[PDB]
Amino acid sequence: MTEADVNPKAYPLADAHLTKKLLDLVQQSCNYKQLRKGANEATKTLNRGISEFIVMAADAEPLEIILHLPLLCEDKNVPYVFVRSKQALGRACGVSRPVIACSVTIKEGSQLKQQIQSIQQSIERLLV
């Protein structure tokens, strides 16, 4: 009973479990003296060539900026994942408020890479 032009419902989308384990990835970043929580600033992370992880709220605004990050598509290397929880993203990044768009910078020759690289594949699987 469905064959019309429905909405994307902010996809892809990760279950409550996937988001739980993924969330920890954000807090872990701060432990490596690395962290990011800003839509306008996020444009720099990608422009610098270190945007491997990106987390944004399905209902986070301004949205016009959330779509500015991606130039072409996943083919052009553009990580992104929606989560049904902002209160968590605000504390994960390290701020006393709901973050709009945050990202995690990857470090070269780092032990964390062994983990970030593994979980990274998770996002790609949903990207395409």
Short mmCIF file of N, CA and C in Angstrom, two decimals, residues 15-103:
data_model
loop_
_atom_site.label_atom_id
_atom_site.label_comp_id
_atom_site.label_asym_id
_atom_site.label_seq_id
_atom_site.Cartn_x
_atom_site.Cartn_y
_atom_site.Cartn_z
N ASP A 15 20.04 2.28 13.76
CA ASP A 15 19.22 1.91 14.91
C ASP A 15 19.77 2.52 16.19
N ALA A 16 19.05 2.32 17.29
CA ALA A 16 19.47 2.85 18.58
C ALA A 16 20.78 2.22 19.04
N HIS A 17 20.99 0.96 18.66
CA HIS A 17 22.20 0.24 19.03
C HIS A 17 23.41 0.78 18.27
N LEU A 18 23.31 0.80 16.94
CA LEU A 18 24.39 1.30 16.10
C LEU A 18 24.81 2.70 16.52
N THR A 19 23.83 3.52 16.89
CA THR A 19 24.10 4.89 17.31
C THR A 19 24.81 4.92 18.66
N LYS A 20 24.48 3.95 19.52
CA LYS A 20 25.09 3.87 20.84
C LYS A 20 26.59 3.63 20.74
N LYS A 21 26.97 2.60 19.99
CA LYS A 21 28.38 2.27 19.80
C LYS A 21 29.10 3.37 19.04
N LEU A 22 28.43 3.94 18.04
CA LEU A 22 29.00 5.00 17.23
C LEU A 22 29.22 6.26 18.06
N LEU A 23 28.28 6.55 18.94
CA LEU A 23 28.37 7.73 19.80
C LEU A 23 29.68 7.73 20.58
N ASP A 24 30.04 6.58 21.13
CA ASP A 24 31.27 6.45 21.90
C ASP A 24 32.48 6.88 21.07
N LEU A 25 32.39 6.69 19.76
CA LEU A 25 33.47 7.06 18.85
C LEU A 25 33.75 8.56 18.92
N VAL A 26 32.69 9.34 19.14
CA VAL A 26 32.82 10.79 19.22
C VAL A 26 33.58 11.20 20.48
N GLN A 27 33.13 10.71 21.63
CA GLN A 27 33.77 11.02 22.90
C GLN A 27 35.22 10.56 22.91
N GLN A 28 35.48 9.42 22.28
CA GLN A 28 36.83 8.87 22.21
C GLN A 28 37.77 9.82 21.48
N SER A 29 37.22 10.56 20.51
CA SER A 29 38.01 11.50 19.73
C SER A 29 38.66 12.55 20.63
N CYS A 30 37.86 13.13 21.52
CA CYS A 30 38.35 14.14 22.44
C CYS A 30 39.56 13.63 23.22
N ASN A 31 39.56 12.33 23.50
CA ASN A 31 40.65 11.71 24.25
C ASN A 31 41.97 11.83 23.49
N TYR A 32 41.87 11.94 22.17
CA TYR A 32 43.05 12.06 21.32
C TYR A 32 43.36 13.52 21.02
N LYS A 33 42.93 14.41 21.91
CA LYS A 33 43.16 15.84 21.74
C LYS A 33 42.57 16.33 20.42
N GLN A 34 41.56 15.63 19.93
CA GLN A 34 40.91 16.00 18.68
C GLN A 34 39.39 15.99 18.83
N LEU A 35 38.74 17.03 18.32
CA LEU A 35 37.29 17.14 18.39
C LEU A 35 36.78 18.27 17.51
N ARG A 36 35.52 18.18 17.11
CA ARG A 36 34.91 19.20 16.26
C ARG A 36 33.39 19.21 16.42
N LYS A 37 32.82 20.40 16.56
CA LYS A 37 31.38 20.54 16.72
C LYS A 37 30.90 21.87 16.16
N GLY A 38 30.71 21.93 14.85
CA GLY A 38 30.25 23.15 14.21
C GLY A 38 29.94 22.96 12.74
N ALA A 39 28.80 23.47 12.30
CA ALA A 39 28.39 23.36 10.91
C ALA A 39 29.27 24.22 10.01
N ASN A 40 29.41 25.49 10.36
CA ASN A 40 30.22 26.41 9.58
C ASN A 40 31.70 26.03 9.64
N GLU A 41 32.12 25.52 10.79
CA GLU A 41 33.51 25.11 10.99
C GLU A 41 33.78 23.77 10.31
N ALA A 42 32.75 22.94 10.22
CA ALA A 42 32.88 21.63 9.59
C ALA A 42 33.36 21.76 8.15
N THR A 43 33.04 22.88 7.52
CA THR A 43 33.44 23.13 6.14
C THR A 43 34.95 23.18 6.00
N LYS A 44 35.63 23.51 7.10
CA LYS A 44 37.08 23.60 7.10
C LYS A 44 37.71 22.21 7.23
N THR A 45 37.10 21.37 8.06
CA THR A 45 37.60 20.01 8.28
C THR A 45 37.69 19.25 6.96
N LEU A 46 36.66 19.39 6.13
CA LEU A 46 36.63 18.71 4.84
C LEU A 46 37.55 19.40 3.83
N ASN A 47 37.57 20.73 3.88
CA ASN A 47 38.41 21.51 2.97
C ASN A 47 39.89 21.27 3.26
N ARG A 48 40.19 20.88 4.49
CA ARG A 48 41.57 20.61 4.89
C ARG A 48 42.02 19.24 4.41
N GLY A 49 41.05 18.34 4.20
CA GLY A 49 41.37 17.00 3.74
C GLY A 49 41.56 16.03 4.89
N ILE A 50 40.68 16.11 5.88
CA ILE A 50 40.75 15.23 7.04
C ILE A 50 39.36 14.88 7.55
N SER A 51 38.36 15.04 6.69
CA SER A 51 36.98 14.74 7.06
C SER A 51 36.63 13.29 6.73
N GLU A 52 36.83 12.41 7.70
CA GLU A 52 36.54 10.99 7.52
C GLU A 52 35.27 10.60 8.27
N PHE A 53 34.96 11.34 9.33
CA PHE A 53 33.78 11.06 10.14
C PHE A 53 32.95 12.33 10.34
N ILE A 54 31.64 12.20 10.16
CA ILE A 54 30.73 13.33 10.32
C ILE A 54 29.38 12.88 10.88
N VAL A 55 28.95 13.53 11.95
CA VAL A 55 27.67 13.20 12.58
C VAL A 55 26.78 14.43 12.69
N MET A 56 25.56 14.32 12.17
CA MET A 56 24.61 15.43 12.21
C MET A 56 23.22 14.93 12.59
N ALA A 57 22.41 15.83 13.15
CA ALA A 57 21.05 15.48 13.56
C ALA A 57 20.09 15.57 12.38
N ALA A 58 19.23 14.57 12.25
CA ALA A 58 18.25 14.53 11.17
C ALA A 58 17.39 15.79 11.17
N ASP A 59 17.26 16.41 12.33
CA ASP A 59 16.46 17.63 12.47
C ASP A 59 17.31 18.77 13.01
N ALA A 60 18.58 18.80 12.62
CA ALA A 60 19.49 19.85 13.07
C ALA A 60 19.57 20.98 12.05
N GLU A 61 19.45 22.21 12.53
CA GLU A 61 19.51 23.38 11.66
C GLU A 61 20.63 24.32 12.09
N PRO A 62 21.04 25.21 11.17
CA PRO A 62 20.46 25.29 9.83
C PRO A 62 20.82 24.08 8.97
N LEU A 63 19.84 23.54 8.26
CA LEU A 63 20.06 22.38 7.40
C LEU A 63 20.74 22.79 6.10
N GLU A 64 20.46 24.01 5.65
CA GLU A 64 21.06 24.53 4.42
C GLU A 64 22.58 24.39 4.46
N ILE A 65 23.14 24.45 5.66
CA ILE A 65 24.59 24.34 5.82
C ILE A 65 25.02 22.88 5.87
N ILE A 66 24.13 22.02 6.34
CA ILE A 66 24.42 20.60 6.44
C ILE A 66 24.57 19.97 5.06
N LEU A 67 23.94 20.59 4.06
CA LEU A 67 24.01 20.10 2.69
C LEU A 67 25.14 20.77 1.92
N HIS A 68 25.71 21.82 2.51
CA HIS A 68 26.80 22.55 1.88
C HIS A 68 28.10 21.76 1.96
N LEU A 69 28.25 20.98 3.02
CA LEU A 69 29.45 20.18 3.22
C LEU A 69 29.75 19.33 1.99
N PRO A 70 28.79 18.46 1.62
CA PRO A 70 28.93 17.58 0.46
C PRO A 70 28.87 18.35 -0.86
N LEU A 71 29.92 18.20 -1.67
CA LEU A 71 29.99 18.88 -2.96
C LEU A 71 29.26 18.08 -4.03
N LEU A 72 29.68 16.84 -4.22
CA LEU A 72 29.08 15.97 -5.22
C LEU A 72 28.32 14.82 -4.56
N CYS A 73 29.06 13.85 -4.03
CA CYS A 73 28.45 12.70 -3.37
C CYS A 73 29.51 11.85 -2.69
N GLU A 74 29.10 10.69 -2.19
CA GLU A 74 30.02 9.78 -1.52
C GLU A 74 31.24 9.49 -2.38
N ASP A 75 31.04 9.46 -3.69
CA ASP A 75 32.12 9.20 -4.63
C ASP A 75 33.24 10.22 -4.47
N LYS A 76 32.87 11.43 -4.05
CA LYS A 76 33.84 12.50 -3.85
C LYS A 76 34.36 12.51 -2.41
N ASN A 77 34.10 11.42 -1.69
CA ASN A 77 34.54 11.30 -0.30
C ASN A 77 33.82 12.32 0.58
N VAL A 78 32.67 11.92 1.12
CA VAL A 78 31.89 12.80 1.98
C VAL A 78 31.09 11.99 3.00
N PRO A 79 31.71 11.74 4.17
CA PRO A 79 31.08 10.98 5.25
C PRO A 79 29.94 11.75 5.91
N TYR A 80 28.91 11.02 6.33
CA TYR A 80 27.75 11.64 6.98
C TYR A 80 26.79 10.58 7.49
N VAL A 81 26.24 10.81 8.68
CA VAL A 81 25.30 9.87 9.29
C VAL A 81 24.31 10.60 10.19
N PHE A 82 23.04 10.24 10.07
CA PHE A 82 21.99 10.86 10.87
C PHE A 82 21.71 10.04 12.13
N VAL A 83 21.39 10.73 13.22
CA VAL A 83 21.09 10.06 14.48
C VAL A 83 19.83 10.63 15.12
N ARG A 84 19.04 9.75 15.72
CA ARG A 84 17.80 10.15 16.37
C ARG A 84 18.05 10.57 17.82
N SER A 85 19.01 11.47 18.01
CA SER A 85 19.36 11.95 19.34
C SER A 85 20.35 13.10 19.27
N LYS A 86 19.93 14.27 19.75
CA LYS A 86 20.78 15.45 19.74
C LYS A 86 21.43 15.67 21.10
N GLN A 87 20.65 15.43 22.16
CA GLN A 87 21.15 15.61 23.52
C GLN A 87 22.43 14.81 23.74
N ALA A 88 22.53 13.66 23.07
CA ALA A 88 23.70 12.80 23.19
C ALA A 88 24.87 13.36 22.38
N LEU A 89 24.57 13.88 21.20
CA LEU A 89 25.60 14.44 20.33
C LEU A 89 26.21 15.69 20.95
N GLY A 90 25.44 16.37 21.79
CA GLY A 90 25.92 17.58 22.44
C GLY A 90 26.92 17.29 23.54
N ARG A 91 26.71 16.18 24.25
CA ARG A 91 27.60 15.79 25.33
C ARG A 91 28.79 15.00 24.80
N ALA A 92 28.58 14.30 23.69
CA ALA A 92 29.64 13.50 23.08
C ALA A 92 30.76 14.39 22.55
N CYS A 93 30.39 15.46 21.87
CA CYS A 93 31.37 16.39 21.31
C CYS A 93 32.09 17.15 22.42
N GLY A 94 31.41 17.32 23.55
CA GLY A 94 32.00 18.03 24.67
C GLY A 94 31.45 19.44 24.81
N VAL A 95 30.13 19.56 24.84
CA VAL A 95 29.49 20.87 24.97
C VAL A 95 28.19 20.76 25.76
N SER A 96 27.87 21.81 26.51
CA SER A 96 26.66 21.84 27.32
C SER A 96 25.47 22.31 26.50
N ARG A 97 25.24 21.66 25.36
CA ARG A 97 24.13 22.01 24.48
C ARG A 97 24.07 21.08 23.28
N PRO A 98 22.90 21.03 22.62
CA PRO A 98 22.69 20.18 21.45
C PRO A 98 23.46 20.67 20.23
N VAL A 99 24.43 19.87 19.80
CA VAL A 99 25.25 20.22 18.64
C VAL A 99 24.47 20.03 17.34
N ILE A 100 24.79 20.85 16.34
CA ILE A 100 24.12 20.78 15.05
C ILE A 100 24.84 19.81 14.12
N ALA A 101 26.11 20.09 13.85
CA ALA A 101 26.91 19.24 12.98
C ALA A 101 28.34 19.11 13.49
N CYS A 102 28.73 17.89 13.84
CA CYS A 102 30.07 17.63 14.35
C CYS A 102 30.81 16.64 13.46
N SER A 103 32.13 16.59 13.60
CA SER A 103 32.96 15.69 12.80
C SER A 103 34.17 15.23 13.60
#
